[PDB]
Design a protein around this ligand. Structure first.
Ligand SMILES: [Mg+2]
Ligand SMILES: [Mg+2]
Ligand code: NA
Lengths: 768, 136, 120, 68, 63
């Protein structure tokens, strides 16, 4: 084992911005690197386009301007790979005057566009990854990617099949869910069920492949067709390699479509006649040195996977439980969680992520007692009490711990009909009703609703404890050890813990200076993705929480010698080494898939084990088709009680946001040298008392907007219908206009109570 | 049908006849999270435990009051007008249909006192929307 | 009636099925969803007796059927009037089989008798 | 002419007072529940021993939806 | 953005007969989600029906 690819599972997100480095983003390579970075630009900006035009002029473009002082001009700035040739010429044709004219065509196409988040893949030399491959004169690396989309070929997503899988329990899912039938797995029928026979259903799979080397940086498109062999070209992604051998993978443009315009995507996950440009597949490489030594990076221990996903509309807001947490939990047995060792840095992420959900979810801003207690502790510089493991702090830690939902799902229940076939664990807390109402009095809840206030795998079953999200067993074990006082923490951590933000900045510095770049990059690719609830989720779904999907999943080290921060792991997906040519590329289970098929798949020697040995398209085939349908269904789920409002996946698909319009009405202090201050005339702003001025700031700060209303999702206009289904339909075109959340500064909040860093949602609709 | 008429621009939100069929209201649940002052001798203060409410700085306590005061709720969500439940359709027409039964459950706005606003900026008389859905 | 081929070769797999009226939770409260009634009639009186339950058990009267016995001892059983209804007028029965908030006057049940002869 | 038979349904002799009058299988019913009901000694065998309402409960609600 | 609409085709034979062909029957909305649910008035839709003016000029050999 001499070379390995990192990350083992890379992630690229669709976007309509261009696939070029200056106007795209990169998947996180170090966790928590930029959580307070108030300079981020996740939408293509005017300045970026202006700057892109500067680089296209420069030295000897001014020379040629004086030489033919028109196809001369447009051929000499390589912009035709961004905007088609016609418009470029007509721009100048019609009337430095050159810049303004070219800028306008680039702006029409890309201004405010959702930037692509591209994954960088690296070759690491092994002693165990010591250092990135360093090419010398005569060295080259060749990368190969083969990707597919099988959503249109696969089964309906009704709920997670593993909810009925007999298990002894893992770090991610208690055995109680299956054992006590808390949320039975449903059978699922085929999508596009009218195309029969396996041979014809192959047409439902989109696939493509490409190769690039360090000898030529030209970008290569991964282009498939749907249906496969009017056909449609589907750009699944783009790949390029730089002269240092690092491969950069761009997802598609976010184009989803039906074969007929009248086929509307009215279901959250299962829409026949639709395709999207999401994909996933196999990443391999060959290293060839001066001397003629050739090293194939092809086996599952050293090669990699890529998956593409919807955009992250709040990149600096982390899901409370991430896909990396799922990897970490998949290695653990529930029955052994009492052997887990806990540091404070293992529970801080839960408190820190929940605290930061206030920027995307109203309930976590105004209806979350834990966040309000954190604010209380911060206001007196007293957060460090939470790091105290001694008896005098025990009641403080317990009061916080006791508000969290236990993933055993055995609290806040009455056992209904013990000993009968109707034996059932029924919640005595707030349930989430089905939309199919029954005009019979609800049963009054007797137990407080536990945290967090998000729906979960079992949403389909009113009264099941699993309707609501719980941090997974191993993370709950950390919190329970913390509550008990059975946790360690260092004095230097204590010194940086007077507020939650100070400790968060400290922990971010620990990630940044950790020397295992390879493992940090493997974790960074996954820490921004959701790890539940899986219905089906946002990016990936429930197979990821089973150790079965990994060919290797080992704890390696704490993030620093004295600080674990949930640890660093070496993991690898199980891979079918034949990729697109696998005899199992087009396998299914017949008319339905059911948990019985998953049960049969656990034995690696059985006929069903192929379910876990991934071929291209296998990670994303479970997700909604098109993904925009799932995104528009990924919002609030309203209960008969108004508050708190439950939200699905708000860290990546926000639900209640702070719009730019509000930012512009609180960012200024009363002494600002501006003719308009916080949306008032200078004279009105300065004529009011300071007390009232600061109150108006906080009032504007407190106005949170439904994220669905940040573009036209079918509710705009006189007697517009609005409603759930039009959002699904309209998201196919509007996903690119939805508000994107970005940290922004407040230079002098004074005594207004507004933090110096706020997270503001930018869209054209919400801008003023 | 007597509510907001949304434009492509988010703000200001146009409203039809909001003085008599309110559009954005201040629910009882929020009133109960700002009506109290920090020195109140209650086991729960503005929806916080006694201990948390009095452990925080006076400045933070008043900020939390104004945040709650500023949370305004679509009047259409003060009862079940067809948007409640997993995959509920919601929308304009279900509102129309459900109001025939739900009109009697919609939030009713009533003037209520704030005994000591202190420095929070909340007026001594607030107008609070009472319904069963919005009460806590 | 049914070849083993259907299950053996998985020709039409049985689907899972969720509960109707799923928002009513606990067996105790789901009893309200069941409409039931009973009655007795004998050859000594041919007066017809209604079989009338309630749903849920406003509350609506549901005539499940009617029974009468003639002087020869023959029982005549009438079914209901074909009245189906929802608890709210806006709950439409848009599904072929599964409509929450609805009840109908269909029923089925147990028929027993006692013959009492003049000699005891 | 296809013949004449003597047949009787299985009956729960307690009828409306049966302890299985309100029996079910939890959040879903599935073929596994019917498989288990084959065994007359199992906690699912009540499926075959009718109490009032057991014959028609499978049918569409309301029936007029199924008819149309 | 913008769609070509073939409103018809014209050809003239050597005898001077003009033959006019209509379009291909292609109707479409500017967005696929705009459905034509009204019998007559659907916004965002175009079709390839047309009508208009037919004129000619005759030139003889004698000028
Ligand atoms: Mg996020
Ligand atoms: Mg009025
Ligand atoms: Na102590």
């Amino acid at each position: 084992c001499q070379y390995k690819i990192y990350p083992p599972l890379g992630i690229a997100r669709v976007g309509n911005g261009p696939a070029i480095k200056p106007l795209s983003l990169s998947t996180p390579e170090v966790p928590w690197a930029h959580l307070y970075d108030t300079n981020v630009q996740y939408l293509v900006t005017q300045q970026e386009l202006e700057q892109l035009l500067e680089e296209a002029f420069g030295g000897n473009v001014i020379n040629e301007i004086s030489q033919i002082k028109i196809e001369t001009i447009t051929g000499l700035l390589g912009l035709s790979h961004l905007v088609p040739q016609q418009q470029l010429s007509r721009s100048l044709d019609n009337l430095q005057q050159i810049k303004g004219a070219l800028l306008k065509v680039l702006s029409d196409h890309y201004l405010h566009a959702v930037k692509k988040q591209a994954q960088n893949f690296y070759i690491y030399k092994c002693d165990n990854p010591v250092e990135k491959l360093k090419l010398t004169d005569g060295d080259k690396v060749t990368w190969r990617v083969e990707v597919a989309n099988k959503k249109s070929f696969w089964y309906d997503y009704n709920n997670a099949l593993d909810l009925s899988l007999h298990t002894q329990g893992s770090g991610n899912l208690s055995k109680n869910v299956s054992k006590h039938r808390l949320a039975p797995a449903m059978t699922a029928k085929r999508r596009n069920p009218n195309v029969i026979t396996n041979s014809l259903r192959k047409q439902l799979v989109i696939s493509s492949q490409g190769s690039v080397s360090s000898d030529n940086n030209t970008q290569v498109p991964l282009r498939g067709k749907f249906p496969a062999n009017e056909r449609h070209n589907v750009l699944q992604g783009s790949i390029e390699c730089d002269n240092e051998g690092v491969l950069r993978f761009y997802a598609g443009n976010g184009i989803s479509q039906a074969l007929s315009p009248s086929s509307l995507n009215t279901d959250f996950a299962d829409n026949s006649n639709w395709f999207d440009d999401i994909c996933d597949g196999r990443v391999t490489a060959v290293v060839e040195l001066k001397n003629g030594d050739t090293f194939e990076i092809q086996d599952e221990q050293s090669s990699a996977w890529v998956a593409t996903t919807p955009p992250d509309y709040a990149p600096q807001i982390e899901p409370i439980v991430t896909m990396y947490d799922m990897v970490s939990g998949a290695a653990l047995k529930e029955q052994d969680l009492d052997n887990l060792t806990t540091q404070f840095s293992d529970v801080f992420p839960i408190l820190y992520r929940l605290y930061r959900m206030q920027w995307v979810n109203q309930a976590d801003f105004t209806d979350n007692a834990v966040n309000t207690q954190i604010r209380e502790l911060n206001s007196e510089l007293g957060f460090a009490q939470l790091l105290d493991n001694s008896a005098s702090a025990k009641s403080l830690r317990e009061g916080i711990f006791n508000q969290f939902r236990n993933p055993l799902f055995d609290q806040d229940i009455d056992v209904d009909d013990p000993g009968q076939s109707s034996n059932e664990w029924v919640s005595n807390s707030r349930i989430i009703p089905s939309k199919d109402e029954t005009n019979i009095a609800a049963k009054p809840a007797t137990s407080s609703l536990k945290l967090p206030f998000y729906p979960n795998d079992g949403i389909d079953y009113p009264g099941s404890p699993v309707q609501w999200f719980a941090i997974p067993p191993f993370m709950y074990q950390h919190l329970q050890n913390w509550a008990a006082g059975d946790f360690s923490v260092t004095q230097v951590e204590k010194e940086s813990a007077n507020t939650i933000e100070e400790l968060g900045l400290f922990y971010s510095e620990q990630f940044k200076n950790s020397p295992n770049s390879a493992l940090l990059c493997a974790r960074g690719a996954l820490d921004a993705l959701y790890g539940g609830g899986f219905h089906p989720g946002v990016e990936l779904t429930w197979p990821m929480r089973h150790n079965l999907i990994y060919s290797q999943n080992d704890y390696v080290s704490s993030v620093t010698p004295e600080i674990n921060l949930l640890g660093l792991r070496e993991f690898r997906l199980k891979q079918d080494l034949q990729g697109l040519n696998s005899p199992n590329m087009y396998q299914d289970f017949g008319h339905v898939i059911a948990v019985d098929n998953v049960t049969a798949s656990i034995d690696p020697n059985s006929d069903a084990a192929w379910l876990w040995r991934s071929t291209p398209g296998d990670l994303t085939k479970w997700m909604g088709i098109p993904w925009q349908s799932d995104a528009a269904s990924c919002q609030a789920v309203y209960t008969p009680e108004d508050f708190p409002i439950p939200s699905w996946w708000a860290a990546n698909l926000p639900v209640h946001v702070l719009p730019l319009a509000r930012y512009n009405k609180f960012k200024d202090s009363q002494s600002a040298d501006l003719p308009e201050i916080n949306g008032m005339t200078h004279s009105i702003a300065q004529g009011m008392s300071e007390e009232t001025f600061e109150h108006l700031r906080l009032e504007q700060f407190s106005q949170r907007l439904d994220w669905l209303h940040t573009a036209d999702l079918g509710f705009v206009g006189y007697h517009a219908e609005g409603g759930y289904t039009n959002g699904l339909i309209q998201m196919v075109s509007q996903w690119k206009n939805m508000a994107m959340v970005m940290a922004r500064p407040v230079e002098n909040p004074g005594s207004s109570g507004i933090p110096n860093v706020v997270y503001v949602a930018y869209s054209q609709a919400d801008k003023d």
